Amino acid sequence: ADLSSRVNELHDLLNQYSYEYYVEDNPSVPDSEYDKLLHELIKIEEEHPEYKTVDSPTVRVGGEAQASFNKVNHDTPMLSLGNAFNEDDLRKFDQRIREQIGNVEYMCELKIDGLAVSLKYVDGYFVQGLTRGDGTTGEDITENLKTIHAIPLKMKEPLNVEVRGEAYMPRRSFLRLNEEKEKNDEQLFANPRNAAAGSLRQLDSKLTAKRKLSVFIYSVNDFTDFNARSQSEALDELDKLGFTTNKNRARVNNIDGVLEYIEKWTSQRESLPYDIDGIVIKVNDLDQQDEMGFTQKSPRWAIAYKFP
Amino acid sequence: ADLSSRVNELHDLLNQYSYEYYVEDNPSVPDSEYDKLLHELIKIEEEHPEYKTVDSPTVRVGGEAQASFNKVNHDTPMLSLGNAFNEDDLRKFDQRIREQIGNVEYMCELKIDGLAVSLKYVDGYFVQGLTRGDGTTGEDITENLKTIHAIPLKMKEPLNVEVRGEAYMPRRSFLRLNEEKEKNDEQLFANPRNAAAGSLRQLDSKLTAKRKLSVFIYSVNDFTDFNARSQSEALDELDKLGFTTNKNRARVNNIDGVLEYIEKWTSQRESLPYDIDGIVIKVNDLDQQDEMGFTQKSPRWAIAYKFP
DSSP states (O other), rough: OOOHHHHHHHHHHHHHHHHHTTTSOOOOSSSHHHHHHHHHHHHHHOOOOGGTTTGGGGGOOOOOOOOOOOEESSSOOOOOEEEEEEHHHHHHHHHHHHHOOSOOOOEEEEEESSSEEEEOOOOOOOEEEEEEETTSSEOOOHHEEETTTTTTTTTOOOOOEEEEEEEEOOOHHHHHHHHHHHHHTOOOOSSHHHHHHHHHSSSSSHHHSSOEEEEEEEEEOOOOOOSBBHHHHHHHHHHHOOOOOOOOOOOEEEHHHHHHHHHHHHHHHHHHSSEEEEEEEESSSSHHHHHBBBBBSBBTTTTEEEEE | OOOOOHHHHHHHHHHHHHHHHHTOOOOOOOOHHHHHHHHHHHHHHHHHHOOTHHHHHHHHGOSSSOOOOOEEEOSSSSOOEEEEEEEHHHHHHHHHHHHHHHSSSSEEEEEEOOOOEEEETTTTTTEEEOTTTTSSSSEBBBHTTTOOTSOBOOSOOOOOEEEEEEEEEEEHHHHHHHHHTTBBOOOOOOOOOHHHHHSSSOOOOHHHHHHOOOOEEEEEEEOOTOOBBHHHHHHHHHHHHOOOOTTEEEESSSSHHHHHHHHHHHHGGGSSSSOEEEEEEEHHHHHHHHHHHHHHBBBBEEEEEOOO
């Protein structure tokens, strides 16, 4: 009955293996080992329920409680970005920045074709996950989001923050899912985004759990507790805090670097294990972002290039 | 929506006031202030449920989850004590200790006429409370025990330990309860112990919460993480760890001291706000207890004197 040693061991191992599988994408042990340890913890929690915890690896299998889908206001409204469609657009963007605050470093990142989500952490624990909604108000899908291994149940520091991310289904998992749908003459999902939408906006988290979803975190509502002085530093810091970020981001020195990054990802996007619908470009320096401010709708320091 | 500051403030205040009321028995603020803050936190948790936590002051109100009453084995079986009925009995106990290990210090304590319970802490959180049962196997009444303010939801150090206590209803609260029963067509409880048993065997934790219960903690299953060298030092340490212990305990030098402690409490027992059915006497020193060991039934190092 005092099983503390084994429970804490199992927590440590399953947490390490999940991170290796789902974040690093670099496994140390085969599935058979993960599954064995997971079934053991599950058995322990069934027979000794006093060992259940909010951040237990068993949270990932989903369970009884259903997503409320209640309307909930974000702590901080999510941004709405202006779009760019060609080099001309990006050069205008660049010139307006260079005329106001001078020559700036940019960060470039892939625009994941996913479902935007806000993930609120209180005392470092994942306590609420909302769809973006209208940007001010979203739907509570917390119980479903909890089953995504790429979302940490506890971060490395006990912060009170709302992180923003893109939830998605990997391309191949989508294709395999569709193969199963056809096998069972069900209607196939249109694309990975629709499949991930369907998977998140349903009532049984155990069904979400069986679907293959991940996330990339791209920002946070409040930088107060961050050492970061730039967007790129913020993403590195999110990495250190335990979050899953996109490794294909790049700092560039000028608009020629931004154009180069877009040209690269025009050709390379095909090979990615997820769909992207564009490239987001941001003035890197956080203070300089503040200097540029917002229009009535959108940051003046960011633009979303859209692939045709 | 980021209500972290007010929530932590409310936890801090309500935890302080609860302890002052129910543990120190020395309030600093009137009920009106406690109730006002509690009602505020409840409203916050209703409208912002992401702020609910396992150790929230709101736990004390009770909830929807019911005690399972499942049969559960204790981590460590609870002791069964031999009895003494007079001075001769206590002298024989004393003589057999001093013939085998020499002259020892004793701890004397009041034997609370309550319901014996084991309270299991994992990582310092109260996770399971069982009735004593047969000493090996008890009934799970965790949800009900959670509503007793004198049981800490979180201890001051993250230990994995099973503490042992006596749960009871104060005499005056028993009397007032009985007065209420004599308003409806309702049968009165026989005595405080019976009232407390009835209160803890409810299916509705919200009813248990409305009853006035308390606890005294008297021991632990495992002293491994305790710096205590004696029973009295262990009780002091439980105090510092955040538990509710009985302050009427005394260290005495010999059997003459034990007899005087019993004579004192024969007279003073009537003035106590709870019922006692005896006095427990223990070899104080933990190593010496280990030295005396056990018969097939009972520690050789302890005895329960029983009032007639």
